[PDB]
Design a protein around this ligand. Structure first.
Ligand code: CA
Ligand code: CA
Ligand code: CA
Ligand code: ZN
Ligand code: ZN
Length: 165
């Protein structure tokens, strides 16, 4: 059986704080485009809010940061996220000890967020090294990036595919 799902289509996110590694606008853009990857294949729609309680909180932090999953310094775990639910449910956390970038150096924020949001929507890891839900990081350019068949099958068995027209 698989884990619980969001039981609505309009889902909100809030960026709690920004990493200083990147331009603030680029954080915004990378996160929006990572949600779009998943919006493109489901009926889910994501919007950013700046106040109010959001479904998905995006956090940058080092070490312990208030949940049961203290980060571990540079390398190791890069980020983690919680599956659908209230409260900490759906939240996505990125380790500030990594160096977050818009490019092939350090750790690419966009690619990392697509994986984390995969978790936030209910997915687990894939055994396919081409899947974005493969557990370890491997850079691919934002332009060439595509969800694998396995990523699509996974997300569509949870939410359906849309819906158009
Ligand atoms: Ca780490
Ligand atoms: Ca939440
Ligand atoms: Ca950093
Ligand atoms: Zn955390
Ligand atoms: Zn993961």
């Amino acid at each position: 059986m698989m884990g619980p799902v969001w039981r609505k289509h309009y889902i909100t996110y809030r960026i709690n704080n920004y990493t200083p590694d990147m331009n603030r606008e680029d954080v915004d853009y990378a996160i929006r485009k990572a949600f779009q990857v998943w919006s493109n294949v489901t009926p889910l729609k994501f919007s950013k809010i700046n106040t109010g309680m959001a479904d998905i909180l995006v956090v940058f932090a080092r070490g312990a940061h208030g949940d049961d999953h203290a980060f571990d310094g540079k390398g190791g775990i890069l980020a983690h996220a919680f599956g659908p639910g209230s409260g900490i449910g759906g939240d996505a956390h990125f380790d500030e000890d990594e160096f977050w970038t818009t490019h092939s150096g350090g750790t690419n924020l966009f690619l990392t967020a697509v994986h984390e949001i995969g978790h936030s929507l209910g997915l687990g890891h894939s055994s396919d090294p081409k899947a974005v839900m493969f557990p370890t990081y491997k850079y691919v350019d934002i332009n060439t990036f595509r969800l694998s068949a396995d990523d699509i099958r996974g997300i569509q068995s949870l939410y359906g595919d849309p819906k158009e027209n």
